[PDB]
Design a protein around this nucleic acid. Sequence first.
RNA 1: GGUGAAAUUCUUGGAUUUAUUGAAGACUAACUACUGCGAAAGCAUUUGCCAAGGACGUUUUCAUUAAUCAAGAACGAAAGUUAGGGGAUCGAAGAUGAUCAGAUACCGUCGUAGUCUUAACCAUAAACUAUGCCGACUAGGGAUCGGGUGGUGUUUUUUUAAUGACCCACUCGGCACCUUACGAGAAAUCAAAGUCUUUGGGUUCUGGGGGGAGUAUGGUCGCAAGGCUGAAACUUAAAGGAAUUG
Lengths: 202, 25, 91, 97, 97, 127, 214
Amino acid sequence: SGRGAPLAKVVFRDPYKYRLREEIFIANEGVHTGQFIYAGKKASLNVGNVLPLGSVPEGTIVSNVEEKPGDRGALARASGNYVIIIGHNPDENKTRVRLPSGAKKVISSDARGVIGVIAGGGRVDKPLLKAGRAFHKYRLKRNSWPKTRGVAMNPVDHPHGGGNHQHIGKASTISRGAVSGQKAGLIAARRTGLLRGSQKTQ
Amino acid sequence: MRAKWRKKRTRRLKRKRRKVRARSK
Amino acid sequence: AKRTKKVGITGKYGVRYGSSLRRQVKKLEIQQHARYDCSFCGKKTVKRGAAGIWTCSCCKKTVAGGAYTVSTAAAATVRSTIRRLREMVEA
Amino acid sequence: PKKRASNGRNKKGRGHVKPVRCVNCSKSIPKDKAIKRMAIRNIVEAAAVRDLSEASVYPEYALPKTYNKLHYCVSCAIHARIVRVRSREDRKNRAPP
Amino acid sequence: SINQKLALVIKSGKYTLGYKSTVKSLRQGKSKLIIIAANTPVLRKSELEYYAMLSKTKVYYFQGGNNELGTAVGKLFRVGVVSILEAGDSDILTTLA
Amino acid sequence: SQVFGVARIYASFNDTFVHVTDLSGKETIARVTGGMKVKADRDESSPYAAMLAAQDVAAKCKEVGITAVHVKIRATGGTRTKTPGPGGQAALRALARSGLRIGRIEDVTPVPSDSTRKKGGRRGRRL
Amino acid sequence: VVDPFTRKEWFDIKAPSTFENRNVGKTLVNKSTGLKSASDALKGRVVEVCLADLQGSEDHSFRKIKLRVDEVQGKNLLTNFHGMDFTTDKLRSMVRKWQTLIEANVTVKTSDDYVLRIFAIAFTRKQANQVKRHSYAQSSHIRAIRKVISEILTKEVQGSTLAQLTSKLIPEVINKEIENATKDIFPLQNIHVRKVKLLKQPKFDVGALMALHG
RNA sequence: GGUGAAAUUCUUGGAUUUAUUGAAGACUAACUACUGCGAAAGCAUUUGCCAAGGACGUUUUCAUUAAUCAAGAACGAAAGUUAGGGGAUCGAAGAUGAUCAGAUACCGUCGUAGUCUUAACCAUAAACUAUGCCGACUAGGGAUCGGGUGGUGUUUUUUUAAUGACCCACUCGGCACCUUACGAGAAAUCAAAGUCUUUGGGUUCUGGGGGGAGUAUGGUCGCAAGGCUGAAACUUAAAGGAAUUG
Ligand SMILES: [Mg+2]
Ligand SMILES: [Mg+2]
Ligand SMILES: [Mg+2]
Ligand SMILES: [Mg+2]
Ligand SMILES: [Mg+2]
Ligand SMILES: [Mg+2]
Ligand SMILES: [Mg+2]
Ligand SMILES: [Mg+2]
Ligand SMILES: [Mg+2]
Ligand SMILES: [Mg+2]
Ligand SMILES: [Mg+2]
Ligand SMILES: [Mg+2]
Ligand SMILES: [Mg+2]
Ligand SMILES: [Mg+2]
Ligand SMILES: [Mg+2]
Ligand SMILES: [Mg+2]
Ligand SMILES: [Mg+2]
Ligand SMILES: [Mg+2]
Ligand SMILES: [Mg+2]
Ligand SMILES: [Mg+2]
Ligand SMILES: [Mg+2]
Ligand SMILES: [Mg+2]
Ligand SMILES: [Mg+2]
Ligand SMILES: [Mg+2]
Ligand SMILES: [Mg+2]
Ligand SMILES: [Mg+2]
Ligand SMILES: [Zn+2]
Ligand SMILES: [Zn+2]
């Protein structure tokens, strides 16, 4: 609930005790019930397994990627996302990858990831098409909806408050050095206006 | 005037009078 | 007789929200409702619930999928290039 | 009326010939219709091909040249290169010389 | 292909479709060969393979799901396994398969 | 018989380029031919000026010491003229005549397999 | 004047074996300081020596050749193979109008665990009793011919060591081991291999490479 | 750097050049031609798979099953529209540097859309041979593509065949070209544009002086841009075609 991606409950034996341990994964697209999941350095390059970014060749597609070895997954977890691996510097044993944002971060080759892309992709291409569908969306995330335009408020409630007409009355772009109670609008915006032209990271 | 320019001329002309009486449509 | 010339399933929304929004909904609607074919048993018995969860009526098998189709283009073009990279590490 | 049964050039029975782009002005021109001339000129000049050979090693081993096919657009082909406008029955003669 | 050699013994010889009838075939020895759709589950597969081993029956794995192997034998339903009982005149019992 | 380099010549229309270096290529020794003793910037490709700065090119060539090299001469090419330029040959004229030694020669002009459509569009430059 | 001319010092190749001449000539890279000077920033170049430059007479004089700087020690510097090619002049002189070109390639391996892409190039000869001015094959030939060159390249590259390979195609008779098959298909003049190149190696294996010198 | 010449521009950021090397998307050079294939649009690296086709060959099979076609339907360059991906190149728009009296341009620069691909639209091009389809007949000539037949023809030599490529002759069906004109045409020219006042093989389609105008109107198709259908009032003695002389 409140998530786009489905989850995969994955059961393993306890190496140190007669016991089962049931982890909770994010389901990469194409995983299925009853499937077998292999985890570790000397594991195979099958969508669903979880291998250190050392063990995989550039161009691999992984999800739930760790920022540090063993933090149990940080990157590329929202439905339909992934990170690509774009090369290894084995001497320092790093691995350089490209995240969903486009930004390219380098991290240890011991950090782990899950071969594949996360499930439930395409969720956002469907319009919500009524206020109620959004209301029910956010019922289960948080009290963020609906949103009142700061410019419909009196000045006591907002920097954009008041006026005999509805206008921001001053630049909507706010300095990073601004103070809490000031930072509303386009914070630290390096640019503004309708983005024209190819936007894919050069 | 050129033939295809006379074409653009009246394609435009018609778009405009199409408009002008969708106003009373 | 044919019941609607263009709205299809999207007639439930009546006249509201504008043709463009309704049309683009209809597309994904048809996707997420239709029965698909099961890869493990070969009948068309896999239907959606809880988008990205696709389950086979008989044989009780479930598969993570796209939000409104079983396999999304991206996934499939990953599957392909994960095979490719795999076959390149035994020979 | 018509002025060539050839009207452009050297195309009967395909309907389309993907075009070439002219060497002088870059203007495209269907391949059948571009005038073609193969430019063979060597590495050499008139008075310059003696001494590059004198203060030299490999005592005139190879002497190669620059091979490149040329395509023009006819208007540019007309401007300088061989068009040299012919005259009604003289233009039907396809003898190169 | 092989689909044609099999599509001969449909019109020619004796067969049986279905997991149950073909394992009665396998334990009564009457099987010379059994063909197994791609998508048929590994447990069934290994079971048949065992029964085969004990009848000394050979097995071929049809590349193609049970849908394909059903349309292969001219039937309009899925078929998870086939079991030939007489290869009416197919050499399928003596081809490289 | 003696010590070798690489020639690395390049002809355009309105400029010319000539430069010695290691046969390995990595380390370059001197090039500047260009617009150097010409300056009206019409005359950048001119043969007179290609010669006038080819002289100061061969000069540093033997000023650090080498007797001989063969050419790698080339027009701009790409999707542009692909035919040699004016101050390509009038330089090695006055660099073979500069008493230096020359050998196995070849063109290195880039030529594609017919792509990366040229500038000017389907009507070309219009004059 | 900083006058770097005095600064640095030349170094030297010579060729490996499978040839007769080996003295390359000389290079200039940098003084060998240590804080970054040449141990590591060596063996990363190539050079362009013609072949009649390298073995003999000009029956052998069209092939370009790359040579990859492999490793260095005192007054060493030694360069193994990197590939090869033809030269613009002859290829532009062998492609005559009014005849058929035929070109093919394959990527195949040698015991020296180098994969590589060979090439080959062949043209049409006009039977020298013959009147028809264009001399064209009929694509029953083009497909069967490139089918047979492809039959043959692999069984010499998979045939043996990149070193023996060099020794196989230097004498060039591969060119007419092609004409062996072809004589039963088409006249097929001017049959050459016309390049060779790859990118991946087994990690250096220093001791293998000194086996070409003495 | 770029051009006729310049300038906008890029250069402590080592630019333009070199070397090694990697990514992305587009295209298929040279071979390429009076050469092939497809209903047309159109189609040029390799290989595998999938179905399809004309010509040929034929003492095989059926036996009039056919020709052409309002309505109706399949495909349909380029650009353009909807939703993803892609977005390297070149590049409507727009912004600029120059030229000019002016210069919204031509030349230069940046570069949005586009250019590429998937799912769906759109249905128009000087979509041209400005030349309906099936059939018959009328005239000479050498090239060439495909099939075929003929051989004490040449070459491969292996040891001569077998073959393969080649030469010569013939015959079907192609893409053309040449010379003539019986003949046709207003001519330019045309083996059809011929076999017409000596006017009739079958069949489909369009035009009836120029403008008005492919405009108005209605119907219909389309998301839109627009497609198909498509007048009249009035106005006018010419407008047009081919060729000759200037
Ligand atoms: Mg609230
Ligand atoms: Mg809001
Ligand atoms: Mg609001
Ligand atoms: Mg208020
Ligand atoms: Mg305030
Ligand atoms: Mg304020
Ligand atoms: Mg206010
Ligand atoms: Mg406001
Ligand atoms: Mg109104
Ligand atoms: Mg005219
Ligand atoms: Mg044409
Ligand atoms: Mg056309
Ligand atoms: Mg002009
Ligand atoms: Mg090609
Ligand atoms: Mg009707
Ligand atoms: Mg773009
Ligand atoms: Mg403008
Ligand atoms: Mg201005
Ligand atoms: Mg403007
Ligand atoms: Mg039309
Ligand atoms: Mg035409
Ligand atoms: Mg005709
Ligand atoms: Mg028409
Ligand atoms: Mg005739
Ligand atoms: Mg007459
Ligand atoms: Mg209308
Ligand atoms: Zn199932
Ligand atoms: Zn031109």
